[PDB]
Amino acid sequence: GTSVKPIFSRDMNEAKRRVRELYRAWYREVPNTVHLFQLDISVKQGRDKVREMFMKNAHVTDPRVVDLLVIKGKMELEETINVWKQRTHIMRFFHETEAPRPTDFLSKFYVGHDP
Amino acid sequence: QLIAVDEKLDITTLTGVPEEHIKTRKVRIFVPARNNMQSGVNNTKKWKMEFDTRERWENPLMG
Amino acid sequence: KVDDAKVSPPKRAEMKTSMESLIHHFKLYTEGYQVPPGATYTAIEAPKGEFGVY
Amino acid sequence: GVRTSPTGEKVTHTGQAYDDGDYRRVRFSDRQKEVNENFAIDLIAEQPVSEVGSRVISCDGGGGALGHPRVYINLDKETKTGTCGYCGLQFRQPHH
Amino acid sequence: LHHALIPHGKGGRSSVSGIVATVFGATGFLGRYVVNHLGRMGSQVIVPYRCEPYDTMHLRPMGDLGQIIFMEWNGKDKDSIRKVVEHSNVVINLVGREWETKNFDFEDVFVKIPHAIAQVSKEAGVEKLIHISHLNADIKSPSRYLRSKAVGEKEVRAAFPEATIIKPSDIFGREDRFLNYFASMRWFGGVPLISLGKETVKQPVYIVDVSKGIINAIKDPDAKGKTFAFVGPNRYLLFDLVQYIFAVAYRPFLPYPLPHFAYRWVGRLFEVSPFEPWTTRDKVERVHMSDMTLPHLPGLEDLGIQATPLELKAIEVLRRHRTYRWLTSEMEDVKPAKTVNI
Amino acid sequence: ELVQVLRRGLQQVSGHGGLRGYLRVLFRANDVRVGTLVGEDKYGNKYYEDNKQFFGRHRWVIYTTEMNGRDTFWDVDGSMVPPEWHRWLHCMTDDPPTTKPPTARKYIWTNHKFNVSGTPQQYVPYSTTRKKIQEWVPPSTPYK
Amino acid sequence: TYKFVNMREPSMDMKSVTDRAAQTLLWTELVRGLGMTLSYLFREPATINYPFEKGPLSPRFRGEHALRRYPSGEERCIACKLCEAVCPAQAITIEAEPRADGSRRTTRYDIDMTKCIYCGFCQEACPVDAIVEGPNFEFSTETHEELLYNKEKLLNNGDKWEAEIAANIQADYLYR
Amino acid sequence: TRPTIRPRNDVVHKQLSAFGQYVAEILPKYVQQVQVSCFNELEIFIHPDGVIPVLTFLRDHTNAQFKSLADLTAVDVPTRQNRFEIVYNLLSLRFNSRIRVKTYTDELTPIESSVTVYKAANWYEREIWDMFGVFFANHPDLRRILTDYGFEGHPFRKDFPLSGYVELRYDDEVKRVVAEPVELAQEFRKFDLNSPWEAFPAYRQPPE
Amino acid sequence: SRGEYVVAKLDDLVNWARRSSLWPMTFGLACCAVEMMHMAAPRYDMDRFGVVFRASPRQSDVMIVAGTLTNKMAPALRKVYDQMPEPRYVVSMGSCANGGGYYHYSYSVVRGCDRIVPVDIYVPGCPPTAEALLYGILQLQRKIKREKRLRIWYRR
Ligand SMILES: CCCCCCCCCCCCCCCCC[C@@H](O)O[C@H](CO[C@H](O)CCCCCCCCCCCCCCC)COP(=O)(O)OCC[N+](C)(C)C
Ligand SMILES: NC(=O)C1=CN([C@@H]2O[C@H](COP(=O)(O)OP(=O)(O)OC[C@H]3O[C@@H](n4cnc5c(N)ncnc54)[C@H](OP(=O)(O)O)[C@@H]3O)[C@@H](O)[C@H]2O)C=CC1
Ligand SMILES: CCCCCCCCCCC1=C(C)C(=O)C(OC)=C(OC)C1=O
Ligand code: SF4
Ligand code: SF4
Ligand code: SF4
Ligand SMILES: [Zn+2]
């Protein structure tokens, strides 16, 4: 039984429903974010980034963890809609200044000691 | 009323830790050894969790 | 300050004269004093209102 | 006791001087290198050795409470003088 | 490799890259981006400056403590060059003017100064030299600016045989004189174009692309004695390019043909300014000159760089030129221009 | 009592060494008060006191016009005050370094220097420790 | 035990009513405020003529750091590293080794003046009065790097300010 | 004892013990423990379900009248199965007294919001959610309060690094403030201060 | 040369005008600002030097960063710095603004305002005394006096 108290959803299906509503809200919001913040990206880039951030957590199987992720995503959306975030806060999702760190063994061996 | 989750605990997606510092880290769990310079044993009572040692380099301006 | 060299540092003249004073100065300025385990909430009437520390 | 390195750089009392091929020398171009000229080792070597007539002497660095913690130095060896571990003053029993 | 010059760290602000670079002309358009890219990864940067120190302040946050060092230099003095290149293993030359003054002509800034820098760096022991030329540099070129570029690159190659020569083509960016120039041409009502800009082809290149190419050429071991051409991914007619510029800035486009001699006279008229001229005869010459095609030279793709199309980066330059009514218009709204790609 | 303050003004004019001295002190220190001279520096600063002024205005320094290497007719700053007159001037003591001179030491700077920031004499930090790891030097002879 | 600040009733007689009406119509309290400002106008200002006049300080004042010497010229510091241990901001960095004469001395003694909080804990923790906070406070720089003090800079500060530092310590040491 | 030792107050100790017994008797369903410290402070350890009732009882009851919420905070103890310790501090002006109410939770179990009992809790609860990641159910407006916009993680957790994971600087290429992985020119120097000799025999633990 | 003399005199005039009228923005973050408030107090009277606080960044000349700069605040500081018209100067006051100070190793503190804006003068202290800040402003005045913009333009 494990006797755990829920946050919002009884099982994974209502969690998936809440995920879909949050995705709908973000997808609707993206063009307004592009217009208001005066971003150089296109609406396609923003919606692809929203999809990427959603798929970053696609492996979660605990409804409580999914509920907390939806709560945090709703917090982020409320921050974005009210222009509490600035252009820098939105653009931090794209890592435009960090150089691309290689993945293969040889390049890591050449560069330094990190695994 | 309870929901009876049946999956092992996993909070990696909620701690805000970057990916590199989850899958590439190795933590050691151990009772620290007594400092051989002293006879007191009060520091050998608890368990410690520590991370693997990464690179340290000399700063060019000050050393 | 309280006349307890395990909590308050001794005078500089005593630290430069007595072995116990030097040892206690060394340990109070390197490690500090151990505080017995426990939790307190202490409040005062600061000029802006009740100021407290847990 | 300053000394100049073969590149023209002053060698500090810690013996630190940049190598002739070290790029960090560029930090001193159009500027200077801060070097303290009063080398403490020479200044403490300049002091005379005090003759005292006891096997154990006491040293507190002078100035009473304004010096260092008071220590006691043994003077039984005639091969070497007794050196204070704090201030570096030397003491000895009269010989010869 | 001189242990103090061994790379260390993660490649960030507090790391050591092993690069000590003296960047001549770092207080200009390309120089600030080059200095920023060097200071991102923890390089030691030497900035020779002739201007007022107030004009160098924007370069200060670009590096960690002690990693950016400002020294005065004189182009006509070799001792200054020697002083600023003594302890460097990389020297980059970005000295240039798009007009001539009473103390420096095109020969002074594109032949004599690069030759002095190259010779002093060679005799001082500098291992790597990067020299910047123009894609359209030509000894027979009508413009003096490209003739001087060709002579100077020949002289630099003579003085520093192992140098790397990079030939970009009309860099565009936030502080450029390419998109801002055409955008500012709106203040005269109509846009004067020689032959309506119908027999001119341009291949502009992004500023970040050129800076990353220079950084990679510094870090590339095979790029020692090569010559590179930095161009964009698309070729445009001048008419279509200016029309697209005015469309992105949401300004009324009124192009008209102006004969070559009349435009040269206008440039000569504008040359009389004691301050920075709005245009010159040389500028008029270079604007209407077609960008050369040099397929025998390595490009940005040979240095691991994918050239950024203008249609992605033009808004960040031209949104400043819009009125209040059109400030918030999105990037994908202005229908990219037609491209003559071979 | 108006004539009294007018006479005090004329006395301040006459006590600065004429009209030229009055103008020099007006345009150098924005003040024309007259006080009893306490002492002079080896650099040229003159120190005056006036116990009838309130705490803060009862001690002051007229700076020299020529310090170590620079012309200080207009460019003066508080860092030019030597440590002994620094202690006197900031009211950390009631005794001038004339009546109570400091203790002489062989290591004490015989010449005070002001703030040297922005000059070729500025302090540049550097690491004062020796190289930690020594590299192996390969032999200079061939191996076959 | 308490008091009220705003619990007084105005009298309702004709005299008080007329006084309040005249106050309303002729603005007497506003004239009182004007009179207070006018009184302040003719007072002597509290301004001092900086930099020619300086604000008062104390022998306990904590300013720029310095490293001291014994009267023989030998360094007082013995690399015990108590100041480094006590520093609340970790502004002190120390490395030591035996000297060529076997003495216990530092090879690196750096203070990050942009990390320092100028609390004086280091000179309390020092057992030999080696590191002090001097009386100097006018040492603004033009670059960040100039505020990273190494051992040479601190020894120069000590050699430069020793005359004032010793007098301040002589004035204060019986309270410590 | 004498001069250097803090004196005791037996009257207050007895009064606090009696009132703790009173509260424990009145609410056996939720109260798990009652304690009175040597410096006369009363603590009541309750079950998480009783947050709203117990607090309500301590606010509205005639004999308690703990009408002021002085402080509400969390304490993180990683070695416990229930990681987070939620602490309420209450002041009663009528009886000139203070009380502490302590409960527990983990990373995934919500706690009931107390804004219906004390309005002052609102921001406090937000801070807990900001600083430790504890979710409060039925909070009228729950969101970050102290950290920067978009900040990931909860910094007051013991396993959160002191300097965090990202740092900020102005980048001129993008003409804006950017965030990058942290690098420190001087690493924070860890000190090992604990003595290997025991200090307080009164708190010695069984050797297991 | 007549032209060199003319540009030198004009440089002198403009430098005198710019350093004799320095208007810092009404901008403070932490305890250091309190000491800044003591520099405008009657004892030091910064207004007697020509130094007047102005709230609008468009009407100000100097940024005095008096207090800790957090990560949440850095974009606002950069924004109100960018909105200062030129010529503009920045004075970093106190340990927190200089290098982070007491909170250098925090997760939410910028380790020195010079990571965000260029800095002309660093005023050490925690906090610097009002007199030390006044010394910093006078040193900035001297630095402005050392400017040679028109001479550099003439020698181009
Ligand atoms: C007519 C309308 C058009 C023109 C509008 C402007 C009019 C001209 C402006 C009036 C000029 C007067 C300013 C001169 C004041 C200088 C005072 C003195 O202090 O300057 C000293 C030296 O002077 C400066 O170096 C140069 C200033 C003099 C300017 C050169 C004269 C050029 C005049 C040309 C006018 C032409 C106008 C445009 C014509 C088209 C430096 O001292 P400083 O360090 O500060 O003070 C330290 C503070 N202490 C004293 C308390 C210790
Ligand atoms: N801009 C473009 O579209 C592309 C330019 N590249 C080449 O790349 C080089 C740099 O480009 P860019 O930054 O845009 O040009 P800029 O005019 O913007 O900057 C030129 C730099 O060189 C310095 N400089 C110029 N003249 C002198 C001189 N007589 N003495 C000393 N220093 C001088 C300037 O210093 P200061 O500020 O003091 O004047 C400045 O730092 C140039 O040689 C240019 O020809 C070639 C293809 C096109
Ligand atoms: C004009 C009279 C002096 C005003 C000085 C303006 C200083 C502006 C700093 C902003 C600020 C204000 C207003 C302020 O009131 C305050 O106290 C809470 C601060 O924290 C120290 C501040 O930083
Ligand atoms: S004054 Fe305080 S913060 Fe500064 S070095 Fe000394 S102990 Fe450290
Ligand atoms: S300055 Fe004093 S406390 Fe610090 S290492 Fe030296 S002797 Fe020890
Ligand atoms: S430097 Fe010190 S006084 Fe100034 S803001 Fe920071 S903590 Fe406060
Ligand atoms: Zn001794």
Per-residue tokens: B17: 């830790």
**DSSP output for G128-171:** SS-EEE-S-----BSSSGGGEE-HHHHHHHHHHHHHHHHHHHHH
User: What distance lies between CA E4 and its chain's CA centroid?
Assistant: 32
Counting as contact any 3 or more CB pairs under 8 A, the partners of F are B, D, E, G, I
3-state DSSP of chain F: CHHHHHHHHHHHHHCCCCHHHHHHHHHHHCCCCCCEEEEECCCCCEEEECCCCCCCCCEEEECCCECCCCECCCCCCHHHCCHHHHHHHCCCCCCCCCCCCCCCCCCCCCCCCCCCCCCCCCCCCCCCCCCCCCCCCCCCCCCC
Please report residues of B whose CB lies closer than 8 A to that of H184.
none
> How many degrees, rounded to 5, is the angle at CA G121 between CA H190 and CA B57?
30
Tell me how far CA of residue B32 lies from CA of A81, A86, B45, H203, I67, in angstroms: 51, 47, 8, 21, 42
The interaxial angle of helices A43-55 and A12-37, nearest 10 deg, is: 150
- Which residues in chain H are closer than 8 Å to G144, comparing Cβ atoms? none
Q: What's the one-letter identity of residue E38? A: L
Is H71 an 8 Å CB contact of chain C?
yes
- Is the CATH code 3.40.1010.10 the one for domain E3-230? no
The data reach a resolution, in angstroms, of 2.6
- What span, in angstroms and rounded, lies between the C-alpha atoms of G88 and G115? 10
Calculate the alpha carbon distances from G46 to B13, C3, D40, F69, G39 in Å. Answer: 62, 44, 48, 35, 15
Taking each helix axis from N to C end, the angle separating A63-81 and A12-37, rounded to the nearest 10 degrees, works out to: 20
Closest CA to H145 of H177, H162, H112, H121: H121
For the Cβ of G86 lying below 6 angstroms from any atom of ligand 5, the answer is no
C-beta separation of H83 from H60 below 8 A: no
Q: Where are the alpha helices (DSSP H) in chain E?
A: 29-40, 78-85, 106-107, 113-124, 144-159, 179-184, 207-219, 238-248, 260-270, 281-287, 310-313, 315-318
Which one of A35, A40, A97 has the shortest CB-CB distance to E316? A40
Atom 3, ligand 3: which residue's CA is nearest? I37
Inter-residue contact A30 to A47 (CB < 8 Å)? yes
Ligand 1-lining residues (CB < 6 angstroms):
F 28, 30, 74-76; I 9, 12-13, 16
CA G128: distance to chain centroid?
Answer: 23
Report the candidate in A23, I129, E101, E294 with the shortest Cα–Cα distance to residue G57: I129
G53 Cα to chain B: minimum distance (Å): 38
CB E153 within 8 A of CB E165: yes
Contacts of residue I104, defined as CB under 8 A and 6 or more positions apart, other chains included, come to G89, G90, G115, I111
- For E66, nearest residue in chain G (alpha carbons): G145
Q: CA-to-CA distance for A30 and E272, rounded, in angstroms? A: 51
Compute, in angstroms, the gap from residue I94 CA to the centroid of ligand 6: 6
**Contact residues for E179 (Cβ-Cβ < 8 A; gap 6+):** E172, E173, E245, E314, E317, E318
- SS3 state at H34: strand
Q: Do G85 and C29 count as a contact with CB atoms less than 8 A apart?
A: yes
Ligand closest to CA I38:
3
**Residues of chain F contacting E66 with CB distance shorter than 8 Å:** 125
Chains F and B touch, using 3 or more CB pairs below 8 Å: yes
Q: Which two tokens stand for residue A8?
A: 């919002």
Exposure string of E22-37, with b = 16+ CB inside 10 Å and e = fewer, is bbbbbbebbbbbbbbb
Specify whether the CB–CB gap between D28 and D36 falls below 8 A: no
Q: Which two tokens stand for residue H1?
A: 């004892």
Contacts of residue H186 in chain G, CB cutoff 8 Å? 90, 93, 112
> In the block, which residue shows the tokens 């010529």?
I87
- The span from the CA of E313 to the CA of E323, in Å, is 19
Cis peptide before E309 (omega within 30 of 0): no
Task: Measure E217 CA to ligand 1 centroid, in angstroms.
Answer: 51
Q: Which of G65, G82, G122 maximizes ligand 5 atoms within 8 Å of its Cβ, making it the mutation to test the pocket?
A: G82
User: Which residue in B13, F54, D91, E186 sits closest to G44, CA to CA?
Assistant: F54
Block residue for tokens 């181009």: I156
User: Phi and psi of D6, rounded to 5°?
Assistant: -60, -10
Q: In this structure, are residues G77 and G169 in contact, taking their beta carbons and an 8 Å threshold?
A: no
Domain range enclosing I60: 2-155
Nearest-CA neighbor of E330 among A30, F10, H194, I33?
A30
Name the residue facing H172 among E9, E14, E36 (closest C-beta): E36
Q: Do chains F and C touch (3 or more CB pairs under 8 A)?
A: no
Assess whether the C-beta atom of I30 lies below 6 angstroms from ligand 6: yes
CA I96 to CA I100: how far, in whole Å?
4
Could you tell me the distance, in angstroms and rounded to a whole number, from the CA of residue E99 to the centre of ligand 2? 10
Instruction: Tell me chain H's radius of gyration from C-alpha atoms.
Output: 22
User: Is the distance from CB of D9 to CB of D18 less than 8 angstroms?
Assistant: yes
> Å from F143 to nearest chain G CA?
39
Distance of CA A67 to the CA centre of its chain: 14
**Whole-angstrom Cα distance, residue G115 to residue G111?**
8
Give G145→chain E minimum CA distance, Å.
6
Of E5, E69, E72, the CB nearest to D26: E69
Ligand 2 centroid distance, CA of E93 (Å): 9
* Cα I24 versus chain centre, distance: 7
Q: Which amino acid is at D8?
A: G
Pairing of strands B48-51, C42-46: unpaired
What tokens does D73 get?
């130095």
Between CA G147 and CA G139 the distance in angstroms is 9
Pick from F56, F77, F118: CB nearest I135: F77
Element (H, E) at I137: helix I130-145
What residues of chain F lie within 8 A of the CB of D16, using their CB?
A: 126-130
Separation in Å, CA of C2 to nearest CA in chain G: 15
Q: What's the CATH number where I101 sits? A: 3.40.50.12280
Q: In 3D, which of E279, E168, E190 has the Cα closest to residue E242?
A: E190
Distance CA E72, CA E95 (A): 14
Which chains does chain A touch, 3 or more C-beta pairs < 8 A? B, E, H, I
Estimate to the nearest angstrom the gap between the alpha carbon of I76 and the chain centroid: 17
Provide the shortest C-alpha distance from residue F112 to chain D (in Å). Answer: 15
User: Cβ separation of H186 and G85 shorter than 8 Å?
Assistant: no
Listed as own residue / partner, the contacts of C2-8 with beta carbons closer than 8 Å and 24 or more positions apart are: C2/H4, C3/H3, C3/H4, C4/H4, C6/C33, C7/C33
Residues of H in contact with A94 (CB under 8 A): none
Do F124 and D16 lie within an 8 Å CB cutoff? no
